[PDB]
Symmetry: C4
Amino acid sequence: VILTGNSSLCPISGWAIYSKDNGIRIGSKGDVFVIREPFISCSHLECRTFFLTQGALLNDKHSNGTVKDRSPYRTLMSCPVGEAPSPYNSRFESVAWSASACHDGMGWLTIGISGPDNGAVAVLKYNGIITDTIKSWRNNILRTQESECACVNGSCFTIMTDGPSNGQASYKILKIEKGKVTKSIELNAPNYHYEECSCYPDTGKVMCVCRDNWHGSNRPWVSFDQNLDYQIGYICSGVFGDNPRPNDGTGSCGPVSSNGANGIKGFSFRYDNGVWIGRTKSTSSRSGFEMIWDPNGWTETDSSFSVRQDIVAITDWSGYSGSFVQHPELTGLDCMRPCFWVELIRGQPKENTIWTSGSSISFCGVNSDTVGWSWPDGAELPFSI
Amino acid sequence: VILTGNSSLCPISGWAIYSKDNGIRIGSKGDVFVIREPFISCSHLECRTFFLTQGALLNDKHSNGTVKDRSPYRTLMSCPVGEAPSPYNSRFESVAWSASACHDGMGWLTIGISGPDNGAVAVLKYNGIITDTIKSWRNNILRTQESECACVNGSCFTIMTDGPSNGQASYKILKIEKGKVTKSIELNAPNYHYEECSCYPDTGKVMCVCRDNWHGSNRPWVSFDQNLDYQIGYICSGVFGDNPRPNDGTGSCGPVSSNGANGIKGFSFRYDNGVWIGRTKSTSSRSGFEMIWDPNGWTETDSSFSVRQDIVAITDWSGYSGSFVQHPELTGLDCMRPCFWVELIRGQPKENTIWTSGSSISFCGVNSDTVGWSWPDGAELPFSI
Amino acid sequence: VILTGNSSLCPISGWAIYSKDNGIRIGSKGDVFVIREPFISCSHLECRTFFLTQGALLNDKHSNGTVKDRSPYRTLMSCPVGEAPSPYNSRFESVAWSASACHDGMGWLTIGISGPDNGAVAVLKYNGIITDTIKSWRNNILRTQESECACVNGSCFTIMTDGPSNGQASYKILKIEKGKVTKSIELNAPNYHYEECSCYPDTGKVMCVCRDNWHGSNRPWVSFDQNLDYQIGYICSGVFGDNPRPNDGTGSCGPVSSNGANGIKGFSFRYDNGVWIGRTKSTSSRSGFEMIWDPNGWTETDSSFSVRQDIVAITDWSGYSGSFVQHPELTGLDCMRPCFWVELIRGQPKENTIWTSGSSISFCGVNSDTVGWSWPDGAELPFSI
Amino acid sequence: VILTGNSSLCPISGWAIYSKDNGIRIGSKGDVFVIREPFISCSHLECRTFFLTQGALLNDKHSNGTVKDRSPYRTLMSCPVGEAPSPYNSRFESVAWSASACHDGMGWLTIGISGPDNGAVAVLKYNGIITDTIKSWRNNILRTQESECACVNGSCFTIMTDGPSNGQASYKILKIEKGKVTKSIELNAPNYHYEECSCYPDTGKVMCVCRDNWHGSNRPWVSFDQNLDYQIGYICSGVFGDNPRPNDGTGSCGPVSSNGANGIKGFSFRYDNGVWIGRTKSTSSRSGFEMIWDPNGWTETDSSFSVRQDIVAITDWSGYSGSFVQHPELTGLDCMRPCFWVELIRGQPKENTIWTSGSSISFCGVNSDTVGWSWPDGAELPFSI
Ligand SMILES: *[C@@H]1O[C@H](CO)[C@@H](O[C@@H]2O[C@H](CO)[C@@H](O[C@H]3O[C@H](CO)[C@@H](O)[C@H](O[C@H]4O[C@H](CO)[C@@H](O)[C@H](O)[C@@H]4O)[C@@H]3O)[C@H](O)[C@H]2NC(C)=O)[C@H](O)[C@H]1NC(C)=O
Ligand SMILES: *[C@@H]1O[C@H](CO)[C@@H](O[C@@H]2O[C@H](CO)[C@@H](O[C@H]3O[C@H](CO)[C@@H](O)[C@H](O[C@H]4O[C@H](CO)[C@@H](O)[C@H](O)[C@@H]4O)[C@@H]3O)[C@H](O)[C@H]2NC(C)=O)[C@H](O)[C@H]1NC(C)=O
Ligand SMILES: *[C@@H]1O[C@H](CO)[C@@H](O)[C@H](O)[C@H]1NC(C)=O
Ligand SMILES: *[C@@H]1O[C@H](CO)[C@@H](O)[C@H](O)[C@H]1NC(C)=O
Ligand SMILES: [Ca+2]
Ligand SMILES: [Ca+2]
Ligand SMILES: [Ca+2]
Ligand SMILES: [Ca+2]
Ligand SMILES: [Ca+2]
Ligand SMILES: [Ca+2]
Ligand SMILES: [Ca+2]
Ligand SMILES: [Ca+2]
Ligand SMILES: [Ca+2]
């Protein structure tokens, strides 16, 4: 079965909780990896949590977070959804300090980038076998989504960036077939900035909503078809999606400069001219999380919206978030089901531990009754080491 | 295979021991979850122990019981029968502080309720994919069986309660097909109280034996067909089934008010006008466990009975108990085999630890020789943390 | 595939090492069960180590060996051959303080005996489902092989004893089909004593070599066909097989009274009128292990033998041992392959620890070059707890 | 599927990183074996890391290295590629202090040598069942590759050595079919020394590149067809491959005596008259690792080469290395893909711990962009015990 990716997003009214791994609470006693970016992705049969570890465990000296983000120890691993990430239940995927993965209906594509800042190489694997490599073309931290790539009709698609994180960089869409890059195109996107894209399939095409780290407090997006014919823009809503950001106000269909530098990985789902935005509750801190339905927020610049669903209270830490979908081949539905995950970051810099790790929660969009609450990390810091 | 559920309960003379997990003894050293309600449910292929954890391990500070029962950390997980519940051998099922699960012959249905007390939502999954949600209709702690739902002819059935635990509440039967609620009905049950139902299939219908927490020291029951045409009553026997309860005496076919407030999850099996009652040995404490065959105990109020089989000595702690069955599709038999599990609760409030957990034992009904004994938890408390 | 069991034992010249689990060395740090009787048994696809645990781990207070042997905590579990027995890699089989198991080509038969000394019940399971029970018929510690039962042509066979361990008892052969006892017969064996039988299939029949705990320092045997037509005797060799025993000398075809009380589980393989005897090296202590080929030792009473192969040095602890076979269905050979396991007992009474546990080694008989050595337990006692 | 082994080595330009297990970093906290020789071998379906352990974990007294290398505790185990080797994720293979393994397309062959120095025996298993044994013919430490054997057209091939490690010894090629030795031949190799061969299939034949521990600082090789018709030589390049070795200079097609005694397990791949050499960066210490393409280095003695790719910095410890391939049956390619693993040795004798262990990295040859870097072990020594 190759996933067709021809269905449109399911009608939904809210988000039902799908998983919670309690990774950090468990790792207080058990043998649990220090991780970041616990992104979920699914096949036609099952869903997995992928994550990066520095190959060190919680409550151990090697968790010391003074290690560079881009270290030769960092690996992409995966485990079943909702389980603490341990060396006893986790599969090895790739050596990587930046990553993506996705399933085409027949096999897993994993992308793991390692190597030096001035010449990083993405290693592509299909079913665990190396199938291609892509080397840095600007010699400045080649990097990718940190969430699932999107697959449509036997090809999978991702976005890579190379260049400054605080100025204009270079952005490419990649089309990958059975692990081999068969087409790419560079975005002609002066004055845009794309990092950490959350990309999903929709009606035979792909939509990516990303992080502008340079000068936008709204999120950039890029959409494209199977030929890589693309469109670009920013989400117009004055309900700003990045962190940090200003208070809600008048939005822009280009980058909103106020509080624009820096950011956080996030996602949104487009429905017609409306948008579901996932975002932190705080405008300044990685605290809280909420889903907002703004029925004209993709294309209109007002700050009005119609629904807010609480996910994590502003008094609790949140973190990266990303989209994942469940295809009809998996669910039996006739539409593409949107879901998202949230990383709940504990430790440095906000808290007095030697380490930084995340646990995770995830939700799927449903057209049935839901409720807002807070499902935070719950660990009591610090630990013993 | 869909399980037909048309067979009648097997003839039995007693109970043979099926499993014992020694979870707490093992958790003295190993990495074992703090758990409650270790209920068993089976498919046509295998049996699993489902349970709720606070996402915390024994011998760790996060096991501190002062965590509310209905926390955002609580999850429904499952592991193979008879194994200590560890993060290294347990599958994640649902985020949940009250739960049920059962298999229809084709896939697992799990029901996990989380959210706030005033608006809890049951997330239903079939084969791990969200298929439906049910929101609180009385805004007062929507809650369910804490043991296996019952499946007959491709539909599965459960009971949910919403409302006070110390007065009249609202009780609904749900009919669920491939994880979708296809029918429900509210019980017209003034003066009844239903919590924590133990429900099993028998001859194409379902029988549930429950807990009256309001004003009954005998157990309420509800039985229904596939259309949800129901009957209700209380077990008539003067061999009282709840805990606490009075000394055995004259029963009632309605709620027995003496020592009626409070209670414990339990079960019973009806055979004609007779009943197999599982109950604690103490009338005041959650201590001991025994099976009693009262050949007229379903419909008659005398305190006479004919067989007692010891399961746990009165000098050892017991706890919740529930029914599970093994269908002909699993066993090759021509009848529905009754089994039960018992939770052996250690820690608070009866013991001086920061935590409360249970281990489990289980037994199956056989028409061959058996013996009474005591198979208690066996852990020596307190632990280190 | 049902195993035919019609082949005769393979011609062999010696024993090649098959496994070593290093369980106790590993359990110095890892989470490893305290176990006894690590017996191996195989299907047509794989081999497993079965074992009894008190549901406690090494380096923990619950390993305190003052617990009765026959406790309600004892369980029969299994794990893959050669792996340390941990709660993370072990399957639960049965609640049991005496056990046997074997595979008929279609499913696993497990037999676990629990309950009180005066009324123990063996629970039989086939594919994990209870299929029969057998209750004590002399009310005096019903007990069985502690090694694999033997299967021939769709039936499996075992020996149970009930009665004194220091005088005449009662011995029965059981024939079991898909987990159900279909025939049994009591041995007419005045002045014999049978415990802890090691039974293997050979040419459509079964041979058991056992432990006389009453008054024999040679080993009793019983052989029988599928109808339970049986023969009994003792191994005639003056190379005495039990522990304790006298120095080698003139044997007897009945029980050898010198040093006859007490014993150890062991095994031997009959070839024509000759015998391979596995035995401790010490006549008085459970120390060392060796395989002896005595070409007339089944029926002749001299103390001459022709081959000795060292297995464990006399300076290292040994313990229980038993036979297992690999059938043609597994191996592809045209003969029945004999193997054996040895339990290497550490701790009490010989050593200053609170616990007693065994690790294991195993060997298979080959007709190719082999070597004698010592493969002892290797743990450094005591541990920390 | 039997692997044909008829394809030729893939064209490559460099090495892409395939795995890194961080075993020692993880073992600082988790339950991880002390291991050596973590060699990779693949089937038509998956790849595994095989290794030898002393049956002891990191951070435990049993890791005390003073245990002889050739102990009765040493076992060959395997785990998935890239996972820390733990008792909870590792399969038992053989009792062994020297080993090989490889898959023929239908099943795993493992070879494990144990026993005394004067009479060691190789136990061969196919699909885990003993199929043959080979006893020492010179009575002086029978020993084998410590990396994967090579399979071609349903036969698998290995090299064993028996005799001195510091003078002339005896070297045999074995041809093994379904775990049975069907042919062997002794190398007529006066003045050669072969240990620890790294052997791979190429165009229906096998090439082995080995370690001369007697008097060669270049590497000996032996190649042979399916009939065991062989050729022998040494790698001619003045880019010397062993450790220790002299500075690069004029090579020889026979053993280079300068710094020739001692050595390290390593590998090289022949392409026409050229060679990819993997070697330590230091000439005196087991430090660093690099791949060197010398386009005439198989047959010509100059010290010129054309490509160097860094793998481990000279400031970090390396260790043994070996070849493994991925056959077309696994990859879908039309050529035989070369890969290699490196063992990163920590502890004694270079570091102040009681133990010695390695972690691993591995790379596969690709004809696409790659990059040099350093991917060292990363553990901070000493540990607690
Ligand atoms: C398991 O959970 C239990 C419930 O949370 C814990 O019990 C609680 O422990 C805390 C200690 O932090 C205690 O807090 C208050 O104790 C005093 C009230 O009786 C009060 O004087 C304290 O106030 C002082 O200290 C705090 C610092 O935390 C300052 O903010 C104040 O300014 C002041 O200096 C404090 O508020 C709780 O009373 C107690 N709760 C209950 C319900 O008993 C257990 O400690 C925990 N067990 C384990 C083993 O960890
Ligand atoms: C890892 O293994 C190493 C090798 O086994 C250990 O080193 C050995 O430690 C032992 C201590 O038991 C030591 O034993 C002898 O030490 C003296 C010789 O130099 C000698 O005086 C001792 O004799 C005395 O003590 C013994 C009791 O054991 C009595 O029998 C005697 O009567 C006398 O009172 C003793 O024989 C070894 O010398 C030493 N071996 C070597 C080769 O250096 C390490 O201890 C171990 N490391 C860890 C961390 O455990
Ligand atoms: C962590 O690493 C940094 C940099 O190497 C060092 O300065 C610091 O002391 C370390 N902290 C701990 C707790 O080991
Ligand atoms: C073990 O148990 C016995 C009997 O209960 C007791 O006497 C002894 O003190 C215990 N030992 C330890 C170390 O706990
Ligand atoms: Ca920004
Ligand atoms: Ca709007
Ligand atoms: Ca009550
Ligand atoms: Ca009655
Ligand atoms: Ca531990
Ligand atoms: Ca005896
Ligand atoms: Ca003789
Ligand atoms: Ca050398
Ligand atoms: Ca050259």
